Design a protein around this ligand. Structure first.
Ligand code: HEM
Ligand SMILES: [C-]#N
Length: 153
């Protein structure tokens, strides 16, 4: 689909819609995670010892916000430039996932959880053209982190 001027315009618009509600969209995101794979719970410091996903934990929120920002920035960078750029951050990202016990087969867990999360966020505006646009941008960014994990291992 490439990322036409028209597709980019579609991701920006839908990201703005997400940040518009972080405590919601972020706790939703962790539930769609534990739906797709329950075991994942022992991994997060702020989920261990708990029984349910904390709803107002600042550690949790600041964590999940950072995750979606990174996927959006990725899509514009693809329409403008044509690529996703690897920096210091994405590399420190890759280290911390390894310390914590995270693997690659974990990644379609977090993707579906994010496409389903954005399908929920845009509702009727949803198009093929948009699904195509966030699918392209996640896949392009995941390709880049998995790359830094394998490197931190
Ligand atoms: C494009 C895809 C992904 C993005 C953009 C992303 C982003 C992030 C960020 C920004 C942090 C916090 C880093 C810090 O500041 O110290 C982090 C932590 C973490 N990540 Fe991910 N991530 C991705 C995929 C995954 C996957 C597939 C898993 C596995 C379920 C995972 C599990 C974790 C865990 C356990 C931590 C530690 C949190 C703690 O215990 O405090 N991530 N991630
Ligand atoms: C990362 N979640």
């Amino acid at each position: 689909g490439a990322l036409t001027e028209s597709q980019a315009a579609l991701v920006k618009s839908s990201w703005e819609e997400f940040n518009a509600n972080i405590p919601k969209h972020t706790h939703r995101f962790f539930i769609l995670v534990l739906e797709i794979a329950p075991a994942a719970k022992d991994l997060f410091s702020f989920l261990k010892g708990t029984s349910e996903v904390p709803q107002n934990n600042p550690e949790l929120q600041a964590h999940a916000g950072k995750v979606f920002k990174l996927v959006y920035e990725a899509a514009i960078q693809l329409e403008v430039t044509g690529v996703v750029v690897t920096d210091a951050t994405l590399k420190n990202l890759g280290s911390v996932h390894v310390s914590k016990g995270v693997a690659d087969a974990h990644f379609p867990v977090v993707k579906e959880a994010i496409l389903k999360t954005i399908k929920e966020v845009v509702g009727a505006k949803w198009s093929e053209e948009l699904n195509s646009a966030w699918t392209i941008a996640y896949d392009e960014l995941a390709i880049v982190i998995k790359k830094e994990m394998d490197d931190a291992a």
